[PDB]
Structure formats: C-alpha cells, structure tokens
Symmetry: C5
Subunit: 103 residues, 5 copies
C-alpha cells in the first residue's frame, strides 16, 4: 500500500496534491436533497468539496465518504492544521480524495 | 457543484438564508415517537428545527439528516459560531437545509 | 412542529417536565442483556433512564434512542448543564423523552 | 427498571461489583480477527475486557457492546474517573457488563 | 481472552510488537476507491497503516477496522501517546492489528 498521501494520490488519474499547511477557514454542510455534501475553504482562496455520493463511487467508498466528512468537521472545529489534500481536479469545486495532517 | 451555502440554497424552492453570526442559545433533542427531532434557538429570537424524517425526504438525505443533528449538538456544546443557515421557510419552525461556519 | 421542549412534551400522555438546571451527577451504562440502557442522576435526587429498546418503540425511534444515549454521555463528560427533561412517568425510573440545554 | 448499577448487577448470575474510583490506567484495542475487543486496566491491578461479540450475546447487545467500547475509549482519553464496574466473573479477564461514573 | 497487547499479538502469525511510546506525527486518510485507508507516522520514521478492508478479513473485523481508524484520528488530534502497536509485518507499511495507550 502507499506510504504517504503523495504516493496514494499518484495512483489515480485526474488528481493533484494541494499543499495547504493551514486550518480550514469555512465549513459548509448540506442535507438538501441531491446536495448532501460538505464544502470547505481556506484563506488562500481555495474551495473544496466532498462530493455527493454518486454512481462513480464504488461500494467501499460509502463509509469512507462519511468518514471524510466527519474528519473535516472535527478538523474545522479544533482548528487543526491540514498539511496536504489529494483532490480530483475534474470537478468544480475540486473534490477531496485524501487528507493529511502533521503535528 | 455549488461553492457556497448561498449558491446551494438558491437551488431550492421555499428557502432562505439567515445570517446568524452567533453561537446557539439552546439545543433541544427529542426521541419521543413522531417527534424525533432537534430544535435550536438563538438570542436573536429565531427557532429552527431539523425535521422528523418523512415522505418528502429522499433516501440520500437519511444519513445527512443524522449528520446535521450531530453537527448541531457539537456546535452547541463547543459554543461554535454559526455563520449562515439555509432554511426551508414552509415549515414552523423553519427547517434546516444547510449550515456554514467560519473562523 | 413544536418550538419548545414543553410544547413537545405536552403532546404526549404520561409525561412531565423536570426543570433540572444542573449538570449530570452520575452516568451509568449497561450492555447486560435485556438491560441495554443508560441511567443518569442529579444531585437534587432525581434518577432517569433511557429505556431498553422495546416493542413500545416505533422504528423511527431506534436511531433517536441511540442518539439520546450519545447525548447523555457527552453532556456528562463535558459537565454541560441540562435545563429541562421531558419524561414519561409510567416507568420507574422515569424515562427520557427529550432534553433541553441552554447557554 | 433498576435505578443503580448495583441493582442492575444483582439481576444477573456470575457478576460482581468492583468499586474502582479511578481513571483507567491503560487502554488496549484490537481489530485482529476473533479478538475484536478492548482491554482496560487500573492502577489497583485489575484488568477487564469488553468481550468479543459471540453466540452467548443476544441481538440487542450488539449495539450496546459497540457503545461500551466507545465509552471506554473516551473515558480513557479524558481521564474521567470510573466509579463502579459490574463484571461477569466467569471470564478471564472479567467481562464488563456495566459502568458508572460520578462527578 | 488475552490480558495484554503482547499476549494478543502472539496469537497471530506474521506479527510483532513495536514500542512507540510517543504521539502520532502525521495522520493521513483516504476515500479514494480501493485505497480507503489510514496511514500514521511517528518521528522515529516508522509508518503504519490500517489496511483497506479486503478478502483476508472476516466479517467480525469490519466494525473493528472502522473503530481502529476512529481511534487513530482522535488519538492524533488529542496528541495522545501510544504505548505499543501490534502489527502484521507482511505488509508495507506494516499493518495495525492492535494498539495500547497508558497514562
Ligand atoms: C486468535 C486467533 O484466532 N488467531 C488465529 C488467526 C485468526 O483466526 C485469524 O487471523 C482471523 O482471520 O488466524 C491465524 C493467524 O495467525 O492469523 N490463521 C489464519 C489462517 C488463514 C490464512 N489465510 C487464508 O485463510 C487464505 C487461505 C485460503 C485457503 C487456503 C489457504 C489460505 C491467514 O493468514 N489469514 C489472516 C491473513 C492476515 O489478515 C490480517 C488482517 O486480518 C492481515 O491483513 C495480514 O497481513 C494477513 O496476512 N490460518 N491461521 C491463526 C491464529 O492462531
Ligand atoms: C489504486 C487504484 O485502484 N487506482 C485506479 C482507480 C480506482 O480503481 C478507481 O478510482 C476506484 O473506483 O481507477 C482508475 C482512476 O484513475 O480512478 N480508473 C478508473 C477508470 C474509469 C472510471 N470510469 C468509469 O468506470 C466509467 C466507465 C464505465 C464503463 C466503461 C468505461 C467507463 C473512472 O475514472 N472512475 C473514477 C471516476 C472518479 O471518481 C472519483 C470518486 O471516486 C471522482 O468523483 C472523480 O471526479 C471521478 O473522475 N479509469 N481509471 C485507475 C487507477 O489506477
Ligand atoms: C439541487 C436540486 O436537485 N434541486 C431541486 C430540488 C431537489 O431535487 C429536491 O428538493 C430533493 O428531494 O427539488 C426541487 C426543490 O426546489 O426542492 N423541487 C422539488 C419539487 C417537488 C417535491 N414534491 C415531492 O417530493 C412530493 C412530496 C411532497 C411532500 C411530501 C411528500 C412528497 C418537493 O418540493 N420536494 C421537496 C419538499 C421539501 O423537502 C424539504 C426536505 O428535503 C423540506 O421538508 C421542505 O419543507 C419541503 O418543502 N419541486 N421543486 C427543485 C430543485 O431544482
Ligand atoms: C387500523 C389502525 O389504524 N390501527 C392502528 C391502531 C388504532 O388506531 C388504535 O388501536 C385505536 O385506539 O393503533 C395501533 C395499535 O397497534 O393499536 N397503535 C397504537 C399506538 C400507540 C403506541 N403503542 C405502541 O407503540 C405499542 C406498544 C405500547 C406499549 C407496549 C408495547 C407496545 C403508544 O402509545 N406508544 C407509546 C408508549 C409509550 O412509549 C414511550 C416510548 O416511546 C415510553 O416507553 C412510555 O412509557 C410508553 O407508555 N401506535 N399504533 C396501530 C394500528 O395500526
Ligand atoms: C424450559 C426452559 O425454559 N428451558 C430453557 C433453559 C432454562 O430456562 C434454564 O436451564 C433454567 O436455569 O435455559 C436454556 C437452556 O438451554 O438451558 N438456556 C439458557 C441459556 C443461557 C442464557 N442465555 C439467555 O438467557 C438468552 C437466551 C434466551 C432464550 C433462549 C436462548 C438464549 C445465559 O446464561 N446468557 C448469559 C451468558 C453470559 O453472557 C454474558 C454476556 O451477555 C457474559 O458473556 C457471561 O460470561 C455469560 O455467562 N440459553 N438457553 C434454554 C431453555 O429453552
């Protein structure tokens, strides 16, 4: 298996690593139907989403999507600094695949 | 997908944005049958609910309804400031569709 | 829908509001079979339970029962003050239907 | 229903009450197959388990077993004092049936 | 059942104990498909994973794998010191079977 977020992100088409080194500026959460998603921003001006579950996802991703949203909320609430994100850049806003945090 | 709560809120009939910019004043949670709901209030005087799950909800909202109740509880307990709420205004109290918070 | 815990509680037979205005004194949790329950006490002397799930509970209550127990544990550990409880008084200890907290 | 952990514990065969009045000393958690369990210890020298789910458990205990482990982890991480444990003493280490804590 | 992490770790082939005695340096979490996993590092330079659920796992492990990832996240955010890890050493990074923490 991969040993770092970069190694992992490189295993996928249409991804890139963003170097964030910052806490989340804003957290947005929706339970509106067809828009069950989370959006985060940073003071850098970047916006990212956890996508609505959809037919591009495989069954093993369902719990992982929910875990990612849980991680983003508690990261936000604790002002925990994020190191890097692995995103898919064929979505607007870019779509989160992985997160790393360092202390 | 949308990039802000206001953009997302505009994709729905019977909504409006409330700019709260405050912590939650009170949190009420019920497990009584047919009233399995959360109610929050603000010192502004506004009251909002997460509705009981019903026939208007689609299957993709079931986990999101539970997540939103989770977010309101921890928001209340940590005195985290809410920025905006997207609410459905065809319910009393108005019904939460989305939340945003910024720091 | 109701806008306060008192309005809500008044929708049911065999209920009453306790105005506690205090943190939980003790928290007890059991996973013993047929006693899968939580019991809380207050220094004023009151003792309340979240009942074991049973045939009096409708399906929509199953998640809500689990949520209430979640809520009681984190309220206890954070020494958060409970304002009101709505309880059923046809069970001993009286059984929690809803809780409110204000800050 | 019972009003105290000791009343509850007395309904069961093969149990006893340990009065600990202390934080947990160590927390061990395993996801190794057939050993999906938590082990806690205390400075007084006692070791206790939450048992692996098994054919001795009834279905209502499955969510309760998971809750108990949730509770032991957060209790460990917060240094929260445990007051009493009701344990089954026909297992080695003795097996947790209920827990209480007071503030 | 076992009473220590070491005793438990010895009930499996392809395992060893690492004595960490340290908090987690980095936390990495992925929802990318077929890489739904968590990776941790320490300032020692070791790296460990919770593996993607796979056909080597038995059904009783599915909730435990999710629990272990929950534990690692909160352990990381709280700066909690880990005492030992039991890991499978036939994977790269080595794969977490059990964790212990003492205070
Ligand atoms: C406490 C206990 O019950 N311990 C036993 C342990 C568990 O039953 C088992 O690990 C749970 O699945 O199974 C042990 C163990 O050492 O892991 N075990 C497992 C095995 C099966 C063996 N392989 C198969 O079943 C595939 C196979 C199919 C057909 C024919 C031949 C091979 C096996 O090693 N299973 C565990 C594999 C490990 O899974 C781990 C996660 O659970 C990690 O991912 C490891 O990296 C991986 O090697 N045999 N013995 C024997 C231990 O004494
Ligand atoms: C580690 C690993 O397994 N990585 C592999 C990766 C995963 O297997 C896959 O993403 C898991 O679902 O699958 C890779 C990938 O880069 O994502 N992949 C996937 C695909 C095709 C595949 N397209 C289809 O299955 C539609 C299709 C159906 C029938 C016939 C033809 C097309 C595809 O790109 N799937 C991922 C789509 C991405 O999903 C993401 C969420 O998981 C995001 O939403 C992205 O914005 C979206 O592009 N091509 N390469 C190749 C890569 O090696
Ligand atoms: C982003 C997106 O997909 N937005 C679309 C939105 C969603 O598809 C829909 O809300 C998702 O369920 O559906 C829109 C909308 O504005 O909500 N839509 C939907 C409808 C009719 C549709 N009527 C039915 O589902 C029948 C029905 C009514 C009541 C009970 C049981 C069954 C309807 O308004 N659905 C939403 C109802 C609202 O649900 C909300 C919870 O999700 C709140 O409870 C509201 O108070 C309630 O009005 N008209 N417009 C159009 C909008 O474009
Ligand atoms: C054709 C038709 O519509 N028939 C319906 C029937 C009639 O409307 C009713 O019988 C007319 O009086 O009403 C039915 C019925 O089963 O009688 N009905 C009745 C109820 C009220 C419903 N009865 C049950 O949930 C079943 C039950 C109660 C107690 C012990 C064990 C099981 C009721 O009052 N539940 C609340 C009971 C309270 O539950 C609380 C937890 O939620 C606390 O534990 C309280 O301590 C407890 O008193 N809900 N549905 C449903 C049935 O479908
Ligand atoms: C006519 C009659 O009532 N016969 C019944 C019989 C008697 O009630 C019993 O022998 C009288 O003492 O008790 C029977 C028996 O076979 O002896 N019995 C006894 C038990 C053990 C019994 N099981 C149940 O009560 C659940 C259950 C109910 C109904 C059917 C099956 C399971 C029991 O001792 N459960 C607790 C075991 C403890 O579980 C704990 C966790 O929950 C810990 O792990 C403890 O270490 C463990 O000892 N299971 N079946 C079933 C039998 O049908």
């Amino acid at each position: 298996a991969p040993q770092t977020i970069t190694e992992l992100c490189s295993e996928y088409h249409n991804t890139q690593i963003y170097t964030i080194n910052d806490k989340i500026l804003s957290y947005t959460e929706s339970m509106a139907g067809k828009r069950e998603m989370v959006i985060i921003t940073f003071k850098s001006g970047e916006t990212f989403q956890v996508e609505v579950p959809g037919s591009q996802h495989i069954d093993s991703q369902k719990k992982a999507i929910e875990r990612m949203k849980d991680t983003l909320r508690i990261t936000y609430l604790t002002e925990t600094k994020i190191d890097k994100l692995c995103v898919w850049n064929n979505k607007t806003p870019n779509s989160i695949a992985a997160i790393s945090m360092k202390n």
